[PDB]
A paper describes a structure:
Three receptor types have been highlighted: VEGFR3 (also called Flt-4) regulates lymphangiogenesis, VEGFR2 (KDR/Flk-1) is the primary proangiogenic receptor, whereas VEGFR1 (Flt-1) has been proposed as a regulator of VEGFR2. In this study, we showed the presence of a metal site at the dimer interface of X-ray structures of human VEGFR1 domain 2 (hVEGFR1d2) solved in the presence of different divalent metal ions. Importantly, the dimer interface involves residues that lie in the core of the hVEGFR1d2 surface that interacts with VEGF-A, VEGF-B or PlGF.
The Cu2+ had a tetrahedral coordination similarly to Zn2+. Three additional Cu2+ ions were also bound to the His214 and to the N-terminal main-chain of an adjacent molecule in the crystal packing. The metal ion coordination site is octahedral for Co2+ and tetrahedral for Zn2+ and Cu2+. However, the analysis of non-redundant structures shows that the coordination of Cu2+ by three or four His residues is highly frequent and that such coordination is scarce for Co2+ and Zn2+. The mean estimation for ΔG dissociation was 12.7 kcal.mol-1, 58.1 kcal.mol-1 and 18.4 kcal.mol-1 for (hVEGFR1d2)2-Co2+, -Zn2+, and -Cu2+ respectively. Because the competition assay results indicated a higher effect of Cu2+ ions compared to Zn2+ or Co2, the Cu2+-induced dimerization of hVEGFR1d2 in solution was verified using analytical gel-filtration chromatography. In the presence of 1 mM CuSO4, two peaks were eluted corresponding respectively to the hVEGFR1d2 dimer (78% of absorption, apparent MW = 27.9 kDa) and monomer (apparent MW = 15.8 kDa). Copper (CuSO4) and palladium (Pd(OAc)2) demonstrated the lowest IC50 values (0.97 and 0.36 μM, respectively). To confirm the specific interaction of Cu2+ with hVEGFR1, the competition assay was performed in the presence of a metal chelator (EDTA, 1 eq.). Under these conditions, Cu2+ was unable to disrupt the VEGF-A/hVEGFR1-ECD interaction.
Author numbering: 132 to 226
The structure:
Amino acid sequence: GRPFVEMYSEIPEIIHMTEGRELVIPCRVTSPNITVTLKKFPLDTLIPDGKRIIWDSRKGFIISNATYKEIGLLTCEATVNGHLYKTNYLTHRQT
Ligand code: NA
């Protein structure tokens, strides 16, 4: 039920992307104070800069201009009360 509004575990949510276009990783959370980390598999953290990558607790991560670097398995992580919670997204190019 928390911290992610919609959690995808073993079966990731598939998201279609296009290079040069906005990509939203929709791991919105149930309250705005939850710190969420974005990792690209295997172990590649994407830090939001408020520019090319924005965090919005009500929307998820917004990537204004998606690149080849965002193709693949993306995971949002949040830690609550000593527990690590994960939700998974698999991107691939529209065509
Ligand atoms: Na989600």
